[PDB]
Ligand binder design. Structure first.
Ligand SMILES: NC(=O)c1ccc[n+]([C@@H]2O[C@H](COP(=O)([O-])OP(=O)(O)OC[C@H]3O[C@@H](n4cnc5c(N)ncnc54)[C@H](OP(=O)(O)O)[C@@H]3O)[C@@H](O)[C@H]2O)c1
Ligand SMILES: NC(=O)c1ccc[n+]([C@@H]2O[C@H](COP(=O)([O-])OP(=O)(O)OC[C@H]3O[C@@H](n4cnc5c(N)ncnc54)[C@H](OP(=O)(O)O)[C@@H]3O)[C@@H](O)[C@H]2O)c1
Ligand SMILES: Cc1ccc(-c2cccc(C(=O)N3CCCC(C)(C)C3)n2)cc1F
Ligand SMILES: Cc1ccc(-c2cccc(C(=O)N3CCCC(C)(C)C3)n2)cc1F
Lengths: 264, 279
């Protein structure tokens, strides 16, 4: 059972926080009394978000502008964010490289860039954040999509990158469990969200109900606060019925009896 | 005689029952073919009377496989050596291979970058290399192969793992790359469907296989029955040959029982009515 008080005084990083869901998450955390450090490329927009967050009641609020294409930036941002706040309780990984619906033909640069930004940078951020999260017994929140669980035409690269996050973060979650790293990892599986970016990209191609981003932002925060492994958020009740893979959980359990990890 | 001959192997039941004759005279590329499963696939294809071009970094090992493929009965057999780390080499290799055989019927993506079982700490270099070699290079090879595959209504065969379907500790980077393959290739399969690109895509989800490389990496860590590489290699060929979307191959019957995800297929089918692609 979530209570907003759970975020009060928590030190939180939100990436891709200048717009959409990331910005909504910043605002919610602001209202909850959390310390926040938001990031994205747009310094000016970040400034506005930061100002509004202080308005909303954030215990403290800062932004650091940069591109997540740059792994050195990602790494230094975490350290700098942690220094401003005196630690870190939750790492919210939410940015993605800009993407539109298109048939895949030969754009290898977009497939590479998508892997770099949507996947690689999440890993670099995690490595950089880990000692602080370990010290706080904090949380990693990874923003994924229904397209990171099942296949859709027109987003091959993006979907590849969301699939990767599941495979990467679900692996380390089992490693953490065994090495006693008390850091939660919540994978967020979102359907269509009414963000300006998504609504434009799907215009005339996709005819489905877009869920509200303010609510989506909250359900993400909630999942992290409760240390849930996965969060499922979609308009359709049929998604919520079919989305889970209980067989996958069973299989992982059955295989767990066939390997020995005492040796690190 | 070949000029006065014609017809088709793929008649009634061919989508269900494999026959070695289905690869006879087919033009096939196998990557990661100097050892393990890839080498075993090369051999099976040889026996079936296929034309084959194999690749891997090791020229001397490739040479040996080629010699043994011709012995075995392959229509023709060649090798081109190089690293799949180099996207230029992956791209030219497809063209070179296609030219040696005068076309392409089946693309078998099987290589990976060397990997061992280790906890993930901070090796970002291995995570990147894993994505480049195990995933990115598959895409570049697919891009290069497509024109020839479209002309022959051929096949793409993607070798994956159980770790490309469910999570395992100690192979975070590797598993990320295998999961990436399913997301990418499953997406283009729906794309080919609607754009009438008659090129099949077979994703192979393999359990532990008794290759030298795997048996070494799991030693003292993993205690499971390993399945034979000869038969694993054949089930891969079969899958591609029959144009099946997914091949599942593992020692446990419990894997075969639980591994499929019918709910994913139902969802994908429900979501298909919510989007218009004509354009
Ligand atoms: N919207 C949907 O329907 C939907 C559905 C499923 C999942 N999701 C997930 O929701 C998360 C947020 O989506 P959204 O729709 O809210 O996104 P959005 O409104 O398009 O905003 C994306 C954010 O990422 C930032 N960004 C873009 N390129 C960047 C780069 N190279 N380096 C650093 N930051 C960069 C953007 O700001 P700057 O341009 O200022 O850098 C912006 O703050 C994503 O991970 C996405 O996969 C969304
Ligand atoms: N073995 C298992 O238990 C198991 C389980 C599930 C899935 N699989 C999958 O089966 C496939 C083959 O596995 P395996 O166990 O048979 O592997 P393996 O015996 O180690 O063979 C790997 C092959 O890839 C080549 N290779 C390595 N690095 C390369 C590079 N940078 N560029 C090009 N070629 C390179 C190797 O030749 P060179 O070193 O000479 O380049 C070799 O021919 C992989 O996709 C693997 O993930 C295996
Ligand atoms: C053909 C089609 C139909 C539906 C979806 C779908 C469903 C749920 C979530 C998402 C998703 O992750 N989005 C929304 C679109 C913009 C993105 C891709 C940057 C983020 N996309 C995708 C499709 F490609
Ligand atoms: C703890 C653990 C980790 C991995 C597995 C497992 C199961 C099925 C297939 C595979 C697989 O893809 N392999 C085998 C290992 C060498 C690789 C990783 C290059 C290829 N791996 C099982 C485990 F118990």
């Amino acid at each position: 059972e979530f209570r907003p008080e759970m975020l009060q005084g928590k030190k939180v990083i939100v990436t891709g926080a200048s717009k959409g869901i990331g910005r909504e998450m910043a605002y919610h955390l602001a209202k909850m009394g959390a310390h926040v450090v938001v990031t994205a490329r747009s310094k000016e927009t970040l400034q506005k978000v930061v100002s509004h967050c202080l308005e909303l009641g954030a215990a403290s609020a800062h932004y650091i502008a940069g591109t997540m294409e740059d792994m050195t930036f990602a790494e230094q941002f975490v350290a700098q964010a942690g220094k401003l706040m005196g630690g870190l309780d939750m790492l919210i990984l939410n940015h993605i490289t800009n993407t539109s619906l298109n048939l895949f033909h030969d754009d290898i640069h977009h497939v590479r860039k998508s892997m770099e930004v949507n996947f690689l940078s999440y890993v670099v951020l995690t490595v950089a954040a880990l000692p602080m999260l370990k010290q706080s017994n904090g949380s990693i929140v990874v923003v994924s999509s229904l397209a990171g669980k099942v296949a859709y035409p027109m987003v091959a690269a993006y979907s590849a990158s969301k699939f990767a996050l599941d495979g990467f973060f679900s692996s380390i979650r089992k490693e953490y469990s065994v090495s006693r790293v008390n850091v939660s990892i919540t994978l967020c599986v979102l359907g269509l969200i009414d963000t300006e970016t998504a609504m434009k990209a799907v215009s005339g191609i996709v005819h489905m109900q877009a869920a509200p981003k303010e609510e989506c932002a909250l359900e993400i925060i909630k999942g992290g606060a409760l240390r849930q492994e996965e969060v499922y958020y979609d308009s359709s009740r049929w998604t919520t019925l079919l989305i889970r893979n209980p067989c996958r959980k069973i299989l992982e359990e059955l295989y767990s009896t066939s390997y020995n990890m005492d040796r690190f």
